[PDB]
Amino acid sequence: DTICIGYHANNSTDTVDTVLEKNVTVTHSVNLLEDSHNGKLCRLKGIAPLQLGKCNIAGWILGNPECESLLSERSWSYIVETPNSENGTCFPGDFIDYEELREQLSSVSSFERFEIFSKESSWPKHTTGGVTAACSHAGKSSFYRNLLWLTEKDGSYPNLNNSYVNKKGKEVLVLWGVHHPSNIKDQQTLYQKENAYVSVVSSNYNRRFTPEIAERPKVRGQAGRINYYWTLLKPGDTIMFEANGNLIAPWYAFALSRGFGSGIITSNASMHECDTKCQTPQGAINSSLPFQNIHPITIGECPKYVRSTKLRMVTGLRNIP
Amino acid sequence: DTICIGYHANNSTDTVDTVLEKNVTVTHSVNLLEDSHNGKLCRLKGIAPLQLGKCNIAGWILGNPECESLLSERSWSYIVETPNSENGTCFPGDFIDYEELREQLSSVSSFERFEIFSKESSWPKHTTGGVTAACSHAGKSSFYRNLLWLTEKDGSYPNLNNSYVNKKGKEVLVLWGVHHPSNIKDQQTLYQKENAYVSVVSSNYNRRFTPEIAERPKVRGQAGRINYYWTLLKPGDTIMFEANGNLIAPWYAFALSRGFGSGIITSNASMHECDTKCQTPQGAINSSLPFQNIHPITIGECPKYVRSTKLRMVTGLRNIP
Amino acid sequence: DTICIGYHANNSTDTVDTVLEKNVTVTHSVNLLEDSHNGKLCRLKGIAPLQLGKCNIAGWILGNPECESLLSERSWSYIVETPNSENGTCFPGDFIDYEELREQLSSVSSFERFEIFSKESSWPKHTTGGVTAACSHAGKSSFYRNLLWLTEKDGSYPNLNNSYVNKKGKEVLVLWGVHHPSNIKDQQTLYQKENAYVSVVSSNYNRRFTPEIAERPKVRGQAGRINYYWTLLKPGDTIMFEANGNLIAPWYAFALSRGFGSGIITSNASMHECDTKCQTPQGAINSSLPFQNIHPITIGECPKYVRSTKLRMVTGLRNIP
Amino acid sequence: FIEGGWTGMIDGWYGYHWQNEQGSGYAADQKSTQNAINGITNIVNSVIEKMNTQFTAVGKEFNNLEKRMENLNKKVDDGFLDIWTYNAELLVLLINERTLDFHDSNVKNLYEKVKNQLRNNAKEIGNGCFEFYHKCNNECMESVKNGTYDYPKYSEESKLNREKI
Amino acid sequence: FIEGGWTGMIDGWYGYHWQNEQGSGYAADQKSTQNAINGITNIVNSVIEKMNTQFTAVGKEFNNLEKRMENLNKKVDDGFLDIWTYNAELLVLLINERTLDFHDSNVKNLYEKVKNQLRNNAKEIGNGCFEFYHKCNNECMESVKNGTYDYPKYSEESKLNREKI
Amino acid sequence: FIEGGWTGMIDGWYGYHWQNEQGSGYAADQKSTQNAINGITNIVNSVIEKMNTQFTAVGKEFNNLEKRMENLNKKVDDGFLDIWTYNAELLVLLINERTLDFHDSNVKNLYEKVKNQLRNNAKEIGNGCFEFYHKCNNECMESVKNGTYDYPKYSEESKLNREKI
Amino acid sequence: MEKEKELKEYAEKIKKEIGDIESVEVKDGKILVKAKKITDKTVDAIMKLTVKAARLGFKVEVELV
Amino acid sequence: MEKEKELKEYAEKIKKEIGDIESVEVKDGKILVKAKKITDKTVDAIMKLTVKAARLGFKVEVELV
Amino acid sequence: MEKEKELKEYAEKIKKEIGDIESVEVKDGKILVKAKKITDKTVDAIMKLTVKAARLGFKVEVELV
């Protein structure tokens, strides 16, 4: 008669590491590192993302013709650009403080796109148009949807003078541009005066812009440039526009809501009907592990990203048959 | 006859945590986390702070009327703003590089406020004044104490031309402003010429300013703006002012000493006679523990801030009666 | 007859620390902290550094006379400034975005210095020269080697108009300057017109500069200023220069290669024939230890820098004779 | 003294193997297995709770004249990534050593429990087994496993057989 | 083997309880208590010395066009706060485990000290107590507590009584 | 029980000292020394491998109007330096404690190995030495050192001498 | 609220799927697991439950029936 | 200098207040505490003294009289 | 490639210099050291070899001949 003391063993091949020992075989282990994902874009907590299929933030917010379908979107959980998001500013120019605009838009989570200045009635003494070859759409010259290019009407460009009073409960994002022709003849043809100015002011904004006329290397076939500007109106503020010329007036503006957890990611993946609480550019994550090695950039409630390839902790005995 | 081996026990209820075990009762423990404070502002190492009771850094340095009492201060250990520090720039405008000025002032620890340009003799051919409703004080129009608003005298505004040679052993902080009227009539009334300039130069500074006249939304009842500028003179340098108009000339300047440990904090607490080696916006800390969970922002020699709610380390045995 | 169990001991005096114990004597230990260095500058992986003996990045890239010998250098592993690198911009002025230029140059690792605009033929209707006392060399007035100061020829300064098409496979760094005289008489003497402009444009660059004439404190004997500008041409881009005056035209430009591991360090040490895989301002490091306490700033594959003074780990027994 | 585990003990982490004239088999030591499971779950909860949820961490864009800021942002990202990879791997190593020492200590404590129960009524074998000098029926085995072994009840027989041996 | 501490031992951390025909009471083991206190103070000094004093850390202000820089500053602050909270709590857990193991090891070493002093002159009880076969007066108790127990002096009486028992 | 090491054992970390009628000297326990060296090398490789190579880390320049950015850069540098100094020193302390416990455990395990080999054929001395009751020649010493001690071969003589003593 | 409801649903799923577990009581910040046996299947289920409870603020305590 | 003087004042205060401590010698980077008994009061005082010495650069060693 | 060649050269140097080492086989991510004795000289050499292999991606295993 005898009684022995021992411990469990099984056919497991899980291996773990210690400081003294490596490749220790254990009966059971928990992998603290998540390395699998759906490989798809998913609805983050039930709300679909904003898919900028062909255009980047600049093209979407300025509303170039090649992603006109985005003008019907109102809300999202995150913004998705693709590696081939080429259609930005269809007309060449410097989008001033563009990265700051991206930072601001990363937290919006909803907007109302409303006509800030009516095309028909806001500019009765100016020509409303602006079709340009650089923004050609469907074989015809076109122009941004959210901007209005004002030019001389009936041989003159009278002093532009307009303002908007923010009657929303939300911040209003106003975007406009200043045209910088390539040569003085363009200036005279479009605005009928060589030295024009654009002035934009609000309670916390004060800028004056002057066109700079010079021959330039052609970008998208244009020797001119349009510099794109923007500002946010506080819920009760007023914005005033004055221009002697060279103004590409605001047409639509965005009344911005604000939220938490939104962001911008460059992703190659496809959209699908699945839901998720965590999203990465490669795909959604569907586990409660503490660490992951899928992608540094995550949206939602996600595991901490580490360079490790395996993080197994012991939850069992040494396996020594 | 017998002899037993054992260990101490008592009526302690201190509890600690381990990786394997939680809520372990121990005879004695040391709480490494400081969570109590005086709840007052104290003299940091014997020197009282600078209490900007009603005004923020901008109002104090520009010296608006509503915190005129601060003009008698010369030294401090730290600067205290309050959550209701509303009285900044009494006249609306953009304080250029204001955050950089805050960063510079956070390390001053002492200044001499001296009259850089005498009001009576420095501007014999210009009108010295500048009372404005926006800076109304005690029922009367007033203006900053450290700035001097120059306007036309006897129907003209001759070319302004003045300079200061830094004869201190310390950096001199010079502040000035440029006036941007709302309409051309203000420009003609004050400066008698539509196109004026302000030019400020030193060995390591070179700026030219031009007024920008445009109707603006009213802030504090003013449709105009004053942009506020500043620069530091190196101990041996010279600063030269030229202006055809629109200059709000420097009147007082600060010869700045430099120190270590100073900072700016927004605090609601009251000042008291106590001393301390550590200060937080909520109150002073009076312990030598390594960690604290009182406030992220600290001045002096303070414990490391952590989100933990309890950090007890064992300094005794398991308490198991 | 007896058999005893014991362990090794020796005459070692190595000491280590634990949480419970301090000054524990051990038979053998490994010092994980590197604290010794060659005390020399060495060839990092076989390539010598760029030694700016007397001048800093500004003087080297602008090519002031006092470090003319650097114009024969083409490649390096890292850039070395010395604590006495005084000869920067020999003519006073603001080197615009100079720190960004340092950041860009820290990763170049090679350049070709080529004559972007021929001195003899590129400016047939302007005077090519620019000797100034501020950049005096060997007892005579001189000027930068990489910049060409254009002035009026035969009583006029015709409209400057030149461009360069980047035919390299590499980015081309173009540097130029704009002259800001002290008084209007200098403007008339040099450029024959009071109001001149400089305009520089490329596919991704658009600036216009205007001279600002004002009396200034003398720096190096000059009451004028030259602001220094720069831009990078993308491998296929074109850069166009237009100027009515005040242009200090580009003469030599750098076709930049790019690399990894390069950097800029301020060092007092001497160059020597030794090789190394790690370099610090104090001297080269020649060990494979994980940590070092020599200098925060390192170039190459170097140990992690820590404030520790000793990091000894036990690789033996307690030494208790 | 215990060399290798048992592949047959399909229930429990630590336990007993026994044989007598009535039967043989394996049985788990419920108290020690329960304590071990609770300790392991405490370790897991410490590992996961002390890690905060990572919230939205999308990157930033910088223009051609903000290279210093871009490099500072990348420096912050790389430094935090290095620190957290180091923390994760070091934590895994430390908790693995702690857990394996914990299991070894549990097995040793169970062995000492049996030894203290049996005193000198059984011959201690240096392989993790005890040989009873007295015959130990199923009731005796159950008593030993539950820590209620009646030592004096078997003292006479155990001493007689030990002296005989 | 020792289940629970003594509420009566008001002096010292580890010590002895004894009783004989002359008296009874508690007494601290000065050497082991001293070493334990020194170790605990070393742990405290390691915890506090290795933490640097936190100096002035006031925040920065950013304007409406510096949102990226503001978010980078907040990111640095939050990352350092997370790392330091993790370090503090992990350090507390590690040092608590180390300290409790240290105290348990000290008690075990004291028990082994007494056992080695007594050899086979006392019956070892599996609860942390030794019963002398020979009568042990106050001088004997003091000798045992001080580690100077004269084993051969009591060998004859201890063997006689052990054989009798 | 083992107080201090041997200065004469010039070969091996842990080993044996022995003496009989044929000779005396020291000898290393090759298996335990080999395992200890492998463990120490594993510790060293864990310490060094888990540290990444530090690549070029030259500082940045800022102008007089970028003081906030300069202070943020210096804050990042100082925070990372503090965190890494703390990590380095804490890691050194932890691995030193682990290594010293590892060596002590190895010595204890070797002692237990010898004890299990010898059973009751030798008198256990509370200083790390075993005194054979039977005469142990060089072959016996080699058998004990290699863990192949033939216990029954010496049982009769050991029991006879132990009873005589 | 939502976390506790999700844990309750998961606990019901586990109690249905794993026959070696008697019950799983989610309540007041802790999940009380009453296991009848400790096998590989049960240990895997319990460790999955522990990982699930973490970051939901619930500790797991296991009782062996 | 100042740190040592402050520690000397604190040590004098402790030696006056805690009757179970014989003396507290601050010197040459270490504080030597000569305790007569180790009770809850004395342990609390010694741990407070250890926390006080830390960040003042002084180690604490305790001797039991 | 280059790392393995450098380690091979260093191992040859060690095997030549340290007479207590039989051989040093650098191969397939690990260096196998076959030592004849473990003395202070040999331990120092082996620890130097271990530090050298680290950051070159090679583990060190020691066999006692």
Ligand SMILES: *[C@@H]1O[C@H](CO)[C@@H](O[C@@H]2O[C@H](CO)[C@@H](O[C@@H]3O[C@H](CO)[C@@H](O)[C@H](O)[C@@H]3O)[C@H](O)[C@H]2NC(C)=O)[C@H](O)[C@H]1NC(C)=O
């Ligand atoms: C929206 O994005 C697409 C893709 O970037 C644009 O189409 C691309 O436009 C470029 C520039 O016009 C084309 O490159 C040019 O091709 C011509 C020959 O056709 C050549 O002479 C030029 O030197 C240059 O290489 C490119 O081929 C074209 N790609 C495709 C697939 O159409 C499009 O113009 C953008 N439209 C808007 C409104 O943003």
Ligand SMILES: *[C@@H]1O[C@H](CO)[C@@H](O[C@@H]2O[C@H](CO)[C@@H](O[C@@H]3O[C@H](CO)[C@@H](O)[C@H](O)[C@@H]3O)[C@H](O)[C@H]2NC(C)=O)[C@H](O)[C@H]1NC(C)=O
């Ligand atoms: C110093 O700070 C105080 C507090 O901010 C200033 O007083 C406040 O001034 C504002 C603006 O003038 C007042 O709001 C206005 O009230 C009028 C009616 O009186 C209303 O018509 C406006 O639309 C606006 O709401 C505010 O009531 C007033 N508060 C108090 C307690 O007086 C003060 O003007 C500042 N002075 C200087 C020199 O900085």
Ligand SMILES: *[C@@H]1O[C@H](CO)[C@@H](O[C@@H]2O[C@H](CO)[C@@H](O[C@@H]3O[C@H](CO)[C@@H](O)[C@H](O)[C@@H]3O)[C@H](O)[C@H]2NC(C)=O)[C@H](O)[C@H]1NC(C)=O
């Ligand atoms: C290259 O760098 C050297 C060293 O910085 C320059 O030489 C230094 O130039 C300064 C300014 O001209 C000299 O200081 C001046 O000295 C005169 C008297 O000679 C005094 O009247 C001024 O008030 C001022 O103090 C300095 O002495 C001189 N040092 C040496 C050793 O020559 C040099 O000018 C630079 N050259 C170029 C082309 O960058």
Ligand SMILES: *[C@@H]1O[C@H](CO)[C@@H](O[C@@H]2O[C@H](CO)[C@@H](O)[C@H](O)[C@H]2NC(C)=O)[C@H](O)[C@H]1NC(C)=O
């Ligand atoms: C021991 O651990 C090492 C490192 O973790 C494992 O290394 C692998 O070994 C195989 C066989 O030689 C190679 O094919 C792989 O390329 C190695 N991987 C790496 C990352 O180096 C090794 O497999 C482990 N051995 C056991 C038995 O678990």
Ligand SMILES: *[C@@H]1O[C@H](CO)[C@@H](O[C@@H]2O[C@H](CO)[C@@H](O)[C@H](O)[C@H]2NC(C)=O)[C@H](O)[C@H]1NC(C)=O
């Ligand atoms: C054991 O530790 C836990 C967590 O630290 C303590 O949790 C508290 O428990 C009480 C009683 O259920 C609740 O009222 C509190 O709200 C809990 N606090 C938290 C933060 O969860 C628990 O009190 C401890 N128990 C003992 C006996 O120490």
Ligand SMILES: *[C@@H]1O[C@H](CO)[C@@H](O[C@@H]2O[C@H](CO)[C@@H](O)[C@H](O)[C@H]2NC(C)=O)[C@H](O)[C@H]1NC(C)=O
């Ligand atoms: C014990 O460790 C301490 C701290 O590491 C050592 O402190 C030195 O002590 C000597 C002698 O008193 C002084 O001259 C030094 O200035 C001390 N150095 C520091 C940094 O404080 C001490 O030397 C060590 N003692 C032994 C025997 O190793």
Ligand SMILES: *[C@@H]1O[C@H](CO)[C@@H](O)[C@H](O)[C@H]1NC(C)=O
């Ligand atoms: C392990 O053993 C179990 C029980 O016999 C069996 O069901 C399972 O398939 C085995 N797994 C492997 C990988 O052999």
Ligand SMILES: *[C@@H]1O[C@H](CO)[C@@H](O)[C@H](O)[C@H]1NC(C)=O
């Ligand atoms: C034009 O400006 C005047 C004030 O100068 C203003 O009253 C008027 O409303 C402006 N016109 C429009 C269309 O806003």
Ligand SMILES: *[C@@H]1O[C@H](CO)[C@@H](O)[C@H](O)[C@H]1NC(C)=O
């Ligand atoms: C992106 O998706 C396309 C379409 O599936 C595929 O061809 C391409 O390889 C993908 N690229 C990356 C980097 O995932």
Ligand SMILES: *[C@@H]1O[C@H](CO)[C@@H](O)[C@H](O)[C@H]1NC(C)=O
């Ligand atoms: C996660 O994966 C499991 C297993 O495939 C699945 O049952 C569950 O529905 C997934 N959860 C989500 C939110 O997709």
Ligand SMILES: *[C@@H]1O[C@H](CO)[C@@H](O)[C@H](O)[C@H]1NC(C)=O
């Ligand atoms: C603990 O016991 C001591 C000694 O009897 C007594 O003075 C003290 O008041 C007690 N404390 C509590 C909380 O019971």
Ligand SMILES: *[C@@H]1O[C@H](CO)[C@@H](O)[C@H](O)[C@H]1NC(C)=O
């Ligand atoms: C005016 O400028 C001249 C030089 O143009 C200078 O000499 C004079 O001092 C200046 N006037 C004053 C009051 O500084």
Ligand SMILES: *[C@@H]1O[C@H](CO)[C@@H](O)[C@H](O)[C@H]1NC(C)=O
């Ligand atoms: C600030 O102090 C006032 C006056 O004591 C008090 O009424 C208010 O609640 C305080 N607010 C905060 C946030 O401390």
Ligand SMILES: *[C@@H]1O[C@H](CO)[C@@H](O)[C@H](O)[C@H]1NC(C)=O
């Ligand atoms: C800290 O608090 C203690 C206890 O209230 C007090 O005696 C001491 O004076 C305080 N120290 C300071 C600097 O206020």
Ligand SMILES: *[C@@H]1O[C@H](CO)[C@@H](O)[C@H](O)[C@H]1NC(C)=O
């Ligand atoms: C240590 O002992 C060895 C062997 O006797 C000897 O060679 C060496 O010089 C000694 N070192 C010191 C520092 O005494």
Ligand SMILES: *[C@@H]1O[C@H](CO)[C@@H](O)[C@H](O)[C@H]1NC(C)=O
């Ligand atoms: C001057 O400009 C014209 C275009 O206006 C251009 O054709 C010509 O090449 C330019 N001259 C030079 C020398 O580049």
